[PDB]
């Protein structure tokens, strides 16, 4: 039983215990929440054990278990540098997501925990599978649990939201499936170790690129294909929102490393000016739009759109710096956007019952712990240094500028507007007068739970912001394998 298969098995045992413990003890709801939390903790503990044993400079997939009982659809698991940190981010985030809803579900708690635990197994399976069809099977398997999570525990407009996220993702994924099936037909197999060895013809690469890019653009999302995010990420329960923004957005980013950079390098090189136009447009249009967004979670949801454009531009830079920056920005956005949704969807929305920004003012006066963390998360969302958000933005933007300067400059302008919308929101909530006259009751400050799910998130971004080498050390050799090009005097040694 490989460590990687252990990762997928623990959350399934937790589901079993959650749904059977009543036959051994009316069981208290606190029991279910404790089973689910410990389950995610042991999954985090296993992912940390794997990371200690992980080797930073191996071109072999590590911790793979030999199957040799070949079938039509077999599940092979393996990990290298590009997948190791996405696996860690999934295992760190999900316990925080569980605590972020400890008190705010209050109904169908068994269903919420089983759905949350199942989502962990599926999302981890996405980052661990060593086959392109296996990748697709898990990328899509999460829609029905996502569809039912929003509908069971979402806000007032959760019906329109759940439909939007289901149908957008399916429609785009159906175009990715067509591209994937063409690959398996030509090659005979979708296993990574032998599909990357193959060489597709240019026009095949061109049509393979559109099919895959249409799906990755719905999931980034790119601007104009992002209606589903505006609805789903806001109407979802807080735990759903954290998982949706901090893990699910990353699948398309990790999928660019496994599905287009190795097999479609000519198409990627010849179409970067189209990816960059869409990437540049998304940086500006989203930034201007979130400046005028009045729902606090939708403002924070809309920020994810702007940052996802920056690491989408990085992965197509064909440079070592852009690709490392893209993973580091995708990781950084995972912590910071998780904290900002806890601040908005968890702290403000539980106190007031509303998310309109018009009703908030001067919260610093009564809530100095919320404002202290909120400001640090508003700095991190603005790409301020000593946050992992700056190291990722600077490396991602440097690659974008070097690959194509006109897009780099425009994507650079995000340094202004991210700051602009992040600080403007911060002032209309924490500063900007005395406590809002709409509040009749006074508000309490962060509970111990709220303090420690924020302190944990702001610790990860800051420590990684001062020493990003912890992550870059395990990306240097694997990131190198996805670069496409040669130097005049280093190529073809004899």
């Amino acid at each position: 039983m490989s460590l990687l298969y252990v990762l997928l098995i623990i959350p399934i045992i937790g589901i079993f215990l959650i749904s059977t413990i009543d036959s051994f003890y009316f069981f208290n709801v606190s029991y279910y929440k404790k089973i689910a939390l410990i389950t995610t903790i042991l999954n985090l503990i296993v992912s940390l054990i794997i990371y200690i044993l992980f080797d930073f400079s191996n071109n072999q997939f590590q911790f793979i278990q030999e199957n040799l009982d070949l079938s039509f659809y077999d599940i092979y698991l393996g990990v290298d540098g590009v997948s190791i940190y996405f696996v860690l981010l999934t295992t760190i985030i999900m316990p925080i997501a569980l605590v972020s809803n400890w008190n705010s579900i209050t109904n169908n708690i068994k269903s919420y925990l089983i759905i949350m635990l199942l989502l962990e197994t599926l999302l981890l399976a996405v980052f661990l599978v060593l086959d392109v069809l296996l990748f697709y099977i898990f990328f899509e398997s999460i829609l029905p649990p996502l569809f039912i999570l929003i509908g069971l525990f979402g806000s007032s407009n959760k019906v329109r939201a759940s439909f939007y996220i289901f149908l957008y993702t399916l429609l785009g994924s159906l175009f990715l499936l067509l591209s994937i099936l063409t690959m398996s037909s030509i090659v005979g197999t979708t296993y990574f170790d032998v599909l990357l060895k193959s060489s597709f013809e240019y026009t095949t690469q061109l049509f393979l690129f559109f099919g895959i890019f249409i799906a990755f653009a719905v999931k980034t999302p790119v601007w104009g294909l992002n209606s589903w995010l505006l609805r789903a990420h806001v109407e979802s329960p807080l735990g759903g929102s954290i998982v949706l923004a901090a893990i699910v957005l990353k699948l398309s980013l990790y999928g660019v490393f496994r599905l287009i950079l190795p097999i479609l390098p000519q198409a990627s090189l010849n179409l970067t000016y189209i990816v960059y136009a869409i990437g540049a447009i998304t940086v500006l249009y989203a930034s201007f739009s979130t400046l005028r967004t009045v729902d606090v979670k939708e403002l924070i949801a809309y920020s994810s759109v702007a940052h996802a454009a920056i690491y989408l531009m990085g992965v197509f830079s064909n440079t070592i710096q852009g690709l490392e920056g893209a993973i580091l920005l995708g990781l950084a956005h995972g912590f910071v956007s998780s904290g900002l949704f806890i601040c908005a969807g968890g702290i403000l929305y539980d106190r007031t019952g509303t998310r309109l920004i018009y009703f908030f003012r001067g919260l610093t006066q009564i809530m100095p712990l919320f404002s202290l963390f909120f400001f640090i998360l508003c700095l991190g969302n603005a790409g301020t240094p000593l946050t992992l958000n700056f190291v990722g933005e600077f490396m991602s933007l440097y690659g974008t500028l070097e690959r194509l300067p006109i897009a780099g400059m425009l994507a650079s302008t995000s340094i202004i507007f991210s700051a602009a919308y992040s600080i403007y929101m911060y002032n209309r909530i924490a500063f900007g007068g005395s406590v809002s006259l709409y509040f009749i009751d006074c508000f309490r400050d962060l509970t111990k739970r709220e303090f420690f799910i924020l302190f944990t998130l702001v610790s990860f971004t800051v420590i990684l912001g001062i020493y990003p080498s912890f992550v870059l050390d395990g990306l240097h050799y694997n990131i190198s394998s996805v670069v496409y090009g040669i130097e005049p005097n280093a190529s073809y040694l004899t």
């Binding site: 970067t272 540049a280 019952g353 018009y358 194509l404 006109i406 009749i440 009751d441 006074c442």
Partner: protein, 75 residues
């Protein structure tokens, strides 16, 4: 109002009405001269302009280790 009891707010009817109008605004969009031009400016022209500049200047320069007597122009 929600599942978990919150504090008592002075829920202003005017602000509540404003936040509902925004959430429902998509149902009332119509194609007119104005709405067609704006939607054509943002979606087609400005993106196609950037795509033109990105396409035209892809590979035009390299800054790496450039010296005096050696240009930045690459094409």
């Amino acid at each position: 109002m929600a599942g978990l009891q919150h504090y008592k707010i002075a829920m202003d009817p005017a602000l509540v009405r404003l936040g509902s109008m925004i959430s429902n605004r998509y149902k009332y969009f119509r194609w007119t001269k104005r709405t067609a031009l704006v939607s054509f400016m943002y979606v087609v022209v400005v993106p196609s302009t950037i795509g033109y500049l990105a396409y035209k200047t892809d590979g035009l320069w390299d800054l790496r280790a450039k010296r005096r007597g050696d240009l930045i122009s690459e094409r």
